[PDB]
Structure 1
Amino acid sequence: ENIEVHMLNKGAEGAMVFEPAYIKANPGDTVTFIPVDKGHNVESIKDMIPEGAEKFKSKINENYVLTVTQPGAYLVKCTIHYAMGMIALIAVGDSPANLDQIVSAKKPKIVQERLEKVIASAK
């Protein structure tokens, strides 16, 4: 199945957000990122995707279809607005083995707070 995600300048959680910011998917699903506001992209974060997965980076303002195969958790960002907290978490399959590692990893304090809300007030 397909899961559609919007990239927005402003949303429920504030400025520069992905909606939804928590995405549950199964191997073989697709995640479609739609730039409803311009100035955004999607890129996988170094060491914050499962082992075996390839990294990716889309073009600014492009509609991007991501096919997820390897199970685990994926933290993705908007390259442009990562420092302002623009991130989304994709969880592929149940009990993603690297999720605690991702939560502990080093990242901007604004992104850390949003990530904690996605796993709490999101799952």
Structure 2
Amino acid sequence: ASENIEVHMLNKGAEGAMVFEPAYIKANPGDTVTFIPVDKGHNVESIKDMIPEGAEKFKSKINENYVLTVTQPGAYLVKCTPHYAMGMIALIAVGDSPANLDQIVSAKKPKIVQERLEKVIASAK
């Protein structure tokens, strides 16, 4: 069955300022991911060329509870549009072995983002 996972958007979390909690999401195809802003001023958006081929781009409105359906297997890098430069990202691993994860780790992106992205990848390891 399809499960729903809740992800929160916070000004301050345990890992720092401007975060997605959790920042790492393990899901199966057909799962929904619900993005919930706790504080005002956050949204969720897929980052260009950081979702698997076949997946559709999306961008939520600020403060709305966004329901994302993941169909394609692989890795999804998401961001909060206004705080992406501050490291506000979340990774969604749908299925096993996202082949595009390598491509997501190497893609050009803010240095503070790379730090968080790597750290979540190591913790999931």
Q: Give the TM interval when normalised to the shorter protein.
A: over 0.9
1:69: Cα distance to partner? Answer: 0.1
Matched position secondary structure for 2:85? helix
Question: In 2, Cα distance between the equivalents of 1:84 and 1:121?
Answer: 20
Instruction: Find the aligned partners of 1:92 and 1:23 in 2 and give their Cα distance.
Output: 8
State the Cα distance separating 1:74 from its structure 2 match: 0.4
Displacement of 1:59 after TM fit? 0.3
SS of the residue corresponding to residue 54 of structure 2 reads coil
Q: What is the aligned partner in structure 2 of residue 75 from structure 1?
A: 77
Q: List runs of 5+ in structure 1 lacking aligned partners.
A: none
Distance 1:115 1:69 in 2: 22
Question: Could you tell me which of 89, 94, 107 is aligned with 1:87?
Answer: 89
* CA positional deviation for 1:19: 0.4
The alpha carbon displacement at 1:9 in A equals 0.1
With structure 2 as the length reference, what TM-score do the two structures score? 0.97
The CA distance in 1 between the partners of 2:71 and 2:25, in whole Å, is 14
1:122 positional shift? 3.4
Structure 2's unaligned 5+ residue stretches are: none
Question: 1:18, 1:54 → 2: CA distance?
Answer: 21
CA distance in 2, matches of 1:122, 1:6: 19
| Shift in Å, 1:66 | 0.4
1:121 to partner: Cα distance:
2.1
Whole-angstrom CA distance in 2 between matches of 1:114 and 1:102: 13
Q: 1:53-84, CA deviations, whole angstroms, 9 ceiling, x for partnerless residues? A: 00000000001110000111000000010000
Q: Deviations over 1:1-28 (max 9, x none)?
A: 0110000000111000000000000111
In the aligned structure 2, how far is the partner of 1:54 from the partner of 1:6?
Answer: 22
What is the percent sequence identity of the aligned residues? 99
Question: CA offsets per residue over residues 22-68 of structure 1, 9 Å max, x none?
Answer: 00001110000001111000000000000000000000000111000
Q: Secondary structure at the match of 1:83?
A: coil
**1:42 and 2:44 equivalent?**
yes
**Aligned-pair RMSD on alpha carbons?**
0.6
Cα distance in 2, alignment partners of residues 35 and 84 from structure 1 = 16
Partners of 1:37 and 1:121 in 2: how far apart? 26
CA distance in 2, matches of 1:28, 1:121: 25
SS at match of 1:23: strand
